[PDB]
Amino acid sequence: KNSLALSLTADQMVSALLDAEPPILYSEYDPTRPFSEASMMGLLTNLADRELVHMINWAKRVPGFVDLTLHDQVHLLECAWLEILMIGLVWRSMEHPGKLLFAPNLLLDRNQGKCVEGMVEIFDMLLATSSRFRMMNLQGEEFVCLKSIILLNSGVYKDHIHRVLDKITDTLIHLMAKAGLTLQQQHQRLAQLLLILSHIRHMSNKGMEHLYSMKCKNVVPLSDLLLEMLDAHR
């Protein structure tokens, strides 16, 4: 069975992806800046839990994703969920150098990270990625392309996914040519963006290790959904 994703034009792919975007969620309106791992990790896992529900429904709207079997959809999301949360975090953190915008009412800086064991290292990695995106002037249309690449690529170990992946590459190039870039600037920028995906993978694996250590510490209860998504990584 042929997939509709391949018949989309580049502008239709971009429009599909923009229209699939989940919203930017809020944290709690308690005006206390968290420092303890208890309050911090409660706020962050609660936020992630609500974001996961939107991510699953976003994924269903990524062209080509629903052409996969249910089991393959589950595998890709289990593999990619933290990468997808993290690239979203660094995207909406771009305009706040030195800080991470977990939510519009939950902006954290490095000083709050160093009150939680192991947080500062992942914090600094996230900040560097945000800063690099900022200096590349990453566009929203490029961001949604990269996020869909992460979804389809991270667990792809399939002919259909690889063709959809190629189409997303076509779409990134189309956006860069639309933005006026020369041919050399196009492939140089495409490479630069895809190499950051290796760092997003690294941050996800480090974060997954930390989330598991937080799970065993039992410091704050985790949702059943967040626990099953975590559990899939073992």
Partner: peptide, 10 residues
């Protein structure tokens, strides 16, 4: 049975 299984069916 996973929650993700249920949520992806909605």
């Amino acid at each position: 049975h996973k929650i993700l299984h249920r949520l992806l069916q909605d």
